[PDB]
Amino acid sequence: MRVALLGGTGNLGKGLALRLATLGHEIVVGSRREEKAEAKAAEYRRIAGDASITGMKNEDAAEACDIAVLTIPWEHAIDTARDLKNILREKIVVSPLVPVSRGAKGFTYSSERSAAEIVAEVLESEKVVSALHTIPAARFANLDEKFDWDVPVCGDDDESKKVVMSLISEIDGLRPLDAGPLSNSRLVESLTPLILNIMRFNGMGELGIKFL
């Protein structure tokens, strides 16, 4: 399928672009600046080898795709989603957004409502799927890295969720697990600050999670 990675010029965007493009999916890296998206798309094609990855401004990337992933810091992702609502309302939108803050006593979940539900509200869409919150970007983007991670996925539209889970499942080392309706997104997003605390208090590097 055609997958747009909005703000795909960054940390999580690189890993998704590399992993999905090598599986043959057509990737569009979106950026606030066309030249930056083009530059990153070129860098990603070079690393991946055989790959269809094109760069364009976010608005054009959103228009071109079937599925859009918001790989943007959450507070800004909400504004970008608002900007693009007439385009994105009709597409599958994946939210990997995590409202997390740091503090003297550790990392905390920083919102009273889940980021994914906030996005669904801004877009006035029933096709928001929440996923990818527990995939550490650096390890994910390292094509030499080996991992075995589970990816909880939430959402209210059965078809949209099925498409996203199927896509995630194609990536070797990832296993998507249905966590229910979008109202469970807070439980999924909360996994990230928990993981960051485990890393902090046990002196461990980047971690994902597995249910077993």
Ligand X SMILES: NC(=O)c1ccc[n+]([C@@H]2O[C@H](COP(=O)([O-])OP(=O)(O)OC[C@H]3O[C@@H](n4cnc5c(N)ncnc54)[C@H](OP(=O)(O)O)[C@@H]3O)[C@@H](O)[C@H]2O)c1
Ligand Y SMILES: C[C@H](OP(=O)(O)OC[C@@H](O)[C@@H](O)[C@@H](O)Cn1c2nc(=O)[nH]c(=O)c-2cc2ccc(O)cc21)C(=O)N[C@@H](CCC(=O)N[C@@H](CCC(=O)O)C(=O)O)C(=O)O
- State the binding site for NADP(+): 9-12, 31-32, 36, 72, 76, 98, 137
3-state secondary structure of 44: helix
C-beta of residue 100 within 8 angstroms of C-beta of residue 110: yes
Minimum separation from the CB atom of position 168 to Na ion (A): 7
Minimum separation from the CB atom of position 37 to ligand X (A): 6
For 141, list phi and psi in degrees, rounded to 5: -80, -10
- Comparison of 57 and 186: residue with beta carbon closer to its own copies: 186
- Comparison of 31 and 134: residue with beta carbon closer to ligand Y: 134
Task: Name, in order, each residue with C-beta under 8 angstroms of 107's C-beta and a sequence gap of 6 or more.
Answer: 100, 101, 192, 193, 196, 197, 200
Q: Between the CA of residue 142 and those of 51, 53, 95, 137, what are the distances in Å?
A: 16, 18, 22, 9
Judged by CB under 6 A, the residue of 136, 155, 176, 208 near ligand X is 136
Judged by CB under 6 A, the residue of 90, 138, 173, 181 near ligand Y is 138
Known binding-site positions for coenzyme F420-(gamma-Glu)n: 207
192 binds ligand Y per the rule CB under 6 A: yes
C-beta of residue 150 within 8 angstroms of C-beta of residue 211: yes
Please name which of 181, 165, 98 lies closest in space to residue 136, comparing C-alpha atoms: 98
8 binds its own copies per the rule CB under 8 A: no
178 binds its own copies per the rule CB under 8 A: yes
Distance CA 78, CA 131 (A): 16
- Comparison of 80 and 192: residue with beta carbon closer to ligand Y: 192
Instruction: Give the distance from CA 187 to its chain's centroid.
Output: 16
135 binds Na ion per the rule CB under 5 A: no
Judged by CB under 5 A, the residue of 123, 174, 179, 196 near Na ion is 174
Residues that bind ligand Y (CB under 6 A): 98, 100, 134, 136-138, 142, 192, 195, 206-207
Residues that bind Na ion (CB under 5 A): 169, 174
